[PDB]
Amino acid sequence: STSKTIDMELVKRKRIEAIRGQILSKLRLASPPSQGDVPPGPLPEAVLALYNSTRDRVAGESPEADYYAKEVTRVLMVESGNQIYDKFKGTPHSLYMLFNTSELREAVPEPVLLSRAELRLLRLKLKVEQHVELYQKYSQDSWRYLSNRLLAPSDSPEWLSFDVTGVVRQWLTRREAIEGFRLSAHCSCDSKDNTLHVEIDLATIHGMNRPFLLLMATPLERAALDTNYCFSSTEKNCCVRQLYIDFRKDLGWKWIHEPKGYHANFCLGPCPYIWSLDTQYSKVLALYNQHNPGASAAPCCVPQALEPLPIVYYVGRKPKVEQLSNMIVRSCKCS
Amino acid sequence: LSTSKTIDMELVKRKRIEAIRGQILSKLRLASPPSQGDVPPGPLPEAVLALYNSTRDRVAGEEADYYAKEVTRVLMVESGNQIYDKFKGTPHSLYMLFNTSELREAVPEPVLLSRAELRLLRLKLKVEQHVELYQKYSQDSWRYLSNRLLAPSDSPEWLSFDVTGVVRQWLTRREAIEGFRLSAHCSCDSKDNTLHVEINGDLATIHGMNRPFLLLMATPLERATNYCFSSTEKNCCVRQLYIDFRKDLGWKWIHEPKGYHANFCLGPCPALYNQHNPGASAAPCCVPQALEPLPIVYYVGRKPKVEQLSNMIVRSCKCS
Ligand SMILES: *[C@@H]1O[C@H](CO)[C@@H](O[C@@H]2O[C@H](CO)[C@@H](O[C@@H]3O[C@H](CO)[C@@H](O)[C@H](O)[C@@H]3O)[C@H](O)[C@H]2NC(C)=O)[C@H](O)[C@H]1NC(C)=O
């Protein structure tokens, strides 16, 4: 291990140097930004709090994201004391969260830059299981179902998240000043012999730590490859290549009755470092979505999206239908 | 010259073909192709083709191992008997119950089961509908599983519901009968002693062929960072590397954090092709699978910026 540990350190240094170009290329910077103007001392109150929640454990829901970094912003809902109580007065099992659309356009000027928008809630009900549903205020009159969530009991207050990216993108398109969501308890009912059975504050609503929208978008200053593009175009870079395999013609096998063949495509092509490649084009950028130059020390043209293959074959007199995983290559990536 | 590029591709294509020869055999865990002298000539039986079709059928629904899974299916109890007299005249509810012994014959032991799907032939062509799936936990109760918003489609469509955990629990249970419930979505809200309630021909095909069934994928009976940091492995795996922006990169511009666990993948990916060449590609590499982002805080002049960079932290590695 005397002459192997030192070899390991060279790999670690190779990884570190790739990360140097890795971070700078993501930020679309040739060199680290100038610091002469920066105030010394601790970070501001809003900056630390913004960075805090990005690391915090949140509740998940259950096109692919790009290589370059996303600017994260957040907008807290309109304050509790004003406006949000008179229109929905005394609703026992419904929580309303409305946002100023101009505050969203201040963070994200145009919708095309927005890549993800999350609605955040500070859940408090520790001991009992609850089933909730999320709704979007499309118009002033009706609400539309978005999603639901079965919430198991948790001993500690937990931050809940709802992916409302598609909804917030439509909000950035609209000029209407106020938009919002509605979180209500799950309704369970059933009709039977002309009878009908029906079964049905949770979170911080005021000040800081009230519900908010977390926006991840490409900043304005900075404003994989599936078979549907790899089969049409001839590319020098890493991509999917067609290969139909006949169990008779190519493998000399007769025991697979169904199918007689399938498209087992392969990945083939050079994977240069993303910063070593020409200025970014939409067709070349896709490959690099999971790009981590130092991870494997040498990036390879490997598959991303794969599909299974069901087959039919015999064991004696007995026919068997089986499914094989990861047989069909649908996309390739450099990583 | 394209004459000497055709030849290069043919060599790559043959390497892929030869790896696939080993891939298929290794997934089925066979050393050589099985003997076919006893196989009946002619078309496959009625049930065998139908079972195979549904594996290919295009369906809309909302890690798995390397080796192949045996696919079986079990149709629900027929309409005319037993399943209507206890649920007589339910206007907005469709009931699907299954014999638990038929499931244990298809999947002998619950540990072997890897996936179970409930299949429905949707019929409502023109109208958008919202449905919910329920499980018969007890003799008195049903339990919420999932829901589905169904957009209009001109053609009858096969719907799928992932009921793996439910069907696996059925094999754990000893009760002879189990089943599901598909009902219309209930939307209500109470306000000042008032209450608004909204709901939403047969919804799906219910009798004869193409009736609801469970599609079972299980390992045959005959085939019977938290891991990378503890053990030292020669093969491809995750390797520890903490990176301090000052100590390792010489940087002062990233105020938060001062560093992070950016692990790397390292190890050769040159009978047991599960960790050797899972993808069967011409040259397998040790590349990461699970990646995690890294939020940072830095300054550009006077304006502080908090940004998130994707795929910075390697959590798992694979041979591909
Ligand atoms: C499972 O999938 C295959 C996918 O093709 C299905 O194959 C089709 O089976 C039908 C069965 O009737 C064939 O229809 C035939 O039509 C000709 C006239 O065109 C008639 O002479 C035959 O008597 C038969 O009725 C159809 O051609 C065949 N598909 C292809 C591409 O040939 C199969 O039906 C599926 N499911 C089953 C068998 O339940």
Residue numbers in the entry:
A (entry chain A): 2 to 63, 70 to 207, 217 to 239, 250 to 361
B (entry chain B): 1 to 62, 71 to 208, 216 to 239, 253 to 298, 312 to 361
Task: Please share text taken word for word from the publication where this structure appeared.
TGF-β protein monomers are biosynthesized with an N-terminal prodomain of ∼250 residues and a C-terminal growth factor (GF)3 domain of ∼110 residues (3–5). However, the GF remains strongly noncovalently bound to the prodomain, which keeps it latent during storage in extracellular milieus. The structure of the pro-TGF-β1 dimer reveals that the prodomain dimer surrounds the GF dimer. TGF-β cannot bind its receptors and signal until it is released from the prodomain (i.e. activated).
The structure contains one monomer in the asymmetric unit; the other monomer of the dimer shown in the figures is a symmetry mate. We also reprocessed to higher resolution and re-refined the previously described, cleaved porcine pro-TGF-β1 structure. Despite the increase in resolution from 3.05 to 2.9 Å, the overall quality of the re-refined model and its Rfree greatly improved. The porcine, PC-cleaved structure has four crystallographically distinct monomers in the asymmetric unit but nonetheless has pseudosymmetry that resembles the symmetry of the human R249A mutant. Four unique monomers are present in re-refined, cleaved, porcine pro-TGF-β1; because chains A and C and B and D are similar to one another, we only show chains C and D in the figures. Residues 252–258 in the mature GF are α-helical, in contrast to the much more extended conformation in the uncleaved GF. The conformations differ among the N termini of the crystallographically distinct GF monomers in cleaved WT pro-TGF-β1. Chains A and C show ordering beginning with N-terminal GF residue 250. Chains B and D show ordering beginning with GF residue 253. Nonetheless, the structural environments of the N-terminal residues of the cleaved GFs are similar overall in having close interactions with other GF residues, and none extend into the solvent-filled channel in the middle of the pro-TGF-β1 ring.
